[PDB]
Structure formats: C-alpha cells, structure tokens
Design an enzyme around this catalytic site. Sequence first.
Site, short mmCIF file in Angstrom:
data_model
loop_
_atom_site.label_atom_id
_atom_site.label_comp_id
_atom_site.label_asym_id
_atom_site.label_seq_id
_atom_site.Cartn_x
_atom_site.Cartn_y
_atom_site.Cartn_z
N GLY A 16 0.80 -1.20 0.00
CA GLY A 16 0.00 0.00 0.00
C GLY A 16 0.84 1.26 0.00
N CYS A 49 3.65 5.10 -6.36
CA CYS A 49 3.34 4.71 -4.99
C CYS A 49 4.10 5.59 -4.00
CB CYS A 49 3.69 3.25 -4.76
SG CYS A 49 2.70 2.07 -5.68
#
Lengths: 50, 50
Positions: A16, A49
């Site tokens: 994540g 990310c």
Amino acid sequence: MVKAAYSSGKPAIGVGAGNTPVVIDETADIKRAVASVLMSKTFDNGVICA
Amino acid sequence: MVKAAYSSGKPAIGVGAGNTPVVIDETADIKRAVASVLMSKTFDNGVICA
C-alpha cells in the site's frame, strides 16, 4: 481491497501507500526544495506509490 | 483458541502442535526403537508439545 484481503483467513501481505509529508524548516535552501518537489510530483501525473 | 486468535484482525502468531507420526520399516533395530518411544512418551505423562 487491502482490508478485504486481510479479512479472509488466509496468509496475505499488502503493498500500500500512505500520505507522505515533507517538512521544510527555516535553515534550508528554498530554491532547491521547491525544484525537487515540483520535479518529483509531476512525474507521470503523480500515480507513483507514495 | 488459536483460531480465535487468528480471526481478530490483529497480528498474531500461534504456538501449536500437530499429531506427530513415527515410521518403523523392516530394516531397523527393534529393541532400541521401542525403548526410545517408551522413554520419550512417558516423560511428564506426555504433555510436552508435539
């Protein structure tokens, strides 16, 4: 969906990203900091990310 | 309770034990195998993990 992957009773790791902050104090160079932020943020419209 | 610890949405590792089998084939010594099994099993009435 990482919470959906967690609550399934199987081994799971999730890749994540969080909200990443930048701290600028008073004893820093000002031009290079703004240049670095504007260079990194516009890379691929900021879908990298973190 | 290890399944109760697993399904709680927190990091968890469980120290459990399985049914451990022993295979005795035809080309083994017979006396020392039975001596070893009877020595290890009666230790503290067999409440050792696995």
